[PDB]
Design a protein around this ligand. Structure first.
Ligand SMILES: OC[C@@H]1O[C@@H](OC[C@@H]2O[C@@H](OC[C@@H]3O[C@@H](OC[C@@H]4O[C@@H](O)[C@H](O)[C@H]4O)[C@H](O)[C@H]3O)[C@H](O)[C@H]2O)[C@H](O)[C@H]1O
Ligand SMILES: [Ca+2]
Length: 415
């Protein structure tokens, strides 16, 4: 009798997993029908923005924690606090506190007060290595606790870069990192950030930031421990990792199902190499599951959001289908200890959540345009056509203008 629209995003294996779990929800609530709108991750923001602009908002949807305040200000997200309190069987205190608090807002600050969404997951972005390749090369395995230095990391990456079939041409590389998702840990571990502590000033022109960015670009262009520009164009580094051509590549929990299907070599997780702080760093991701402020069926919509985020049966299905780690802290701790489930050091995911994972800088700002500007024109640096020092000096005032505007627009939208 009652229809809900659920909008979300995912890689192919995520789409399959959530479609399955939505069917499980529909089996449990035979009166509720769920209509699915799903996109690829890169197409999502545009589609959701269009839907909000038209005020034709899906009943339940994924959203970016960095938009929480903006969404509250424009009355996009329903206050779901009472629906959550009033539903027996769920105790949000069993869920990662860092996850739940990203979607609390008390009228002035994020992290406390009323619930405007539920955490899809936490998404620690670990470093993986190809154990098969190491062992075939006779290189000592990485330590599971002690981070490589940047020099040590390049040194092993060079040893792994070789012509393995003796035809004259390199066919195996140390790594092939995507700056969009892996530059953060190098910047952070080098004691830098995109913005200052107050989150109001752009700081990409910090010598430590420049050093990190230049080191990143140098992996491809100077140290030559990656496929060439043209080789990455031919087949991207994610695909080359799947095919066993790369010694190191990141791993998120959402990758696990895809890796189960496609990766034939043995791989495991380690800390990221550490810069000047000697402490590894990476990001912990998250998406919120929100309910439309204008939903005609708030009780059921929240029941869907709860089934995906906190319900032990919905959660067990998602974890079983290998697209995320348990939202329940206890289930997660037990999961990590089970040696029948690989990677062997999946504990690293929890260490990231608990110890050395950070949030994306845009989670602290009212919108992310200032940060999108940094990446928009980054490619000449990565391709060795422009120095990191020259780019950040050019980008900084453009980023700063956009960040100032976000700060002002917050002031005007919250009145
Ligand atoms: O190209 C290969 C692909 O890229 C790498 O993954 C990067 C992206 O992760 C996938 O999405 C996973 C979701 O994102 C996580 O949150 C990250 C950010 O944190 C918040 O600030 C933002 O809202 C959110 O964007 C979340 O925990 C997780 O569900 C996406 O498909 C990839 O583009 C990997 O190397 C490989 O999968
Ligand atoms: Ca060869």
């Amino acid at each position: 009798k009652i229809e809900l629209t659920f909008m979300f995003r995912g890689q192919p294996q995520e789409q399959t997993a959530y479609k399955n779990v939505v069917k499980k929800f529909e089996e449990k609530h035979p009166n509720v029908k769920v209509n699915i709108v799903v996109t690829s991750p890169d197409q999502y923001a545009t589609k959701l923005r269009a839907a909000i602009a038209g005020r034709k908002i899906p009943d339940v949807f994924y959203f970016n924690p960095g938009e929480l305040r903006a969404y509250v200000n424009s009355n996009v997200l329903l206050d779901i606090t009472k629906y959550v309190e009033n539903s027996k069987g769920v105790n949000l205190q069993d869920i990662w506190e860092k996850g739940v608090n990203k979607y609390r807002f008390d009228g002035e600050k994020v992290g406390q007060g009323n619930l405007y969404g539920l955490p899809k997951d936490l998404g620690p972005f670990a470093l993986g290595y190809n154990k098969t390749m190491f062992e075939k090369a006779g290189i000592p395995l990485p330590d599971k606790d002690k981070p490589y230095t940047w020099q040590e990391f390049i040194d092993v990456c060079k040893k792994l870069t070789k012509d393995t079939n003796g035809d004259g041409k390199l066919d195996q590389w140390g790594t092939g990192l995507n700056a969009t998702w892996t530059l953060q840990g190098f910047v952070w571990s080098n004691g830098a950030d995109w913005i200052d502590e107050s989150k109001t000033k752009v700081t990409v022109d910090d010598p430590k930031f420049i050093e990190a960015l230049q080191f990143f670009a140098d992996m491809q262009n100077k140290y030559k421990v990656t496929p060439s520009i043209a080789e990455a164009q031919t087949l991207d580094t994610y695909q080359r990792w799947l095919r066993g051509q790369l010694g190191f590549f990141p791993v998120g929990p959402w990758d696990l199902a895809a890796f189960d299907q496609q990766i034939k070599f043995e791989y495991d997780l380690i800390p990221w190499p550490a810069g000047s702080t000697g402490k590894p760093a990476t990001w912990v991701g998250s998406l919120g599951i929100g309910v439309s402020s204008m939903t005609k069926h708030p009780k059921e919509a929240v029941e869907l959001a709860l089934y995906l985020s906190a319900d032990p049966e919905g959660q067990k299905a998602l974890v079983d289908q290998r697209v995320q780690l348990p939202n329940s802290v206890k289930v997660a701790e037990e999961w990590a200890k089970d040696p029948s489930i690989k990677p062997a050091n999946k504990q690293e995911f929890l260490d990231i959540i608990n110890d050395y994972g950070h949030s994306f800088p845009t989670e602290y700002t009212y919108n992310g345009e200032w940060y999108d500007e940094f990446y928009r024109n980054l490619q000449p640096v990565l391709d060795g056509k422009m120095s990191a020092e020259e780019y950040v000096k050019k980008a900084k005032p453009k980023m700063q203008k956009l960040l100032d505007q976000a700060i002002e627009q917050e002031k005007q939208a919250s009145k």
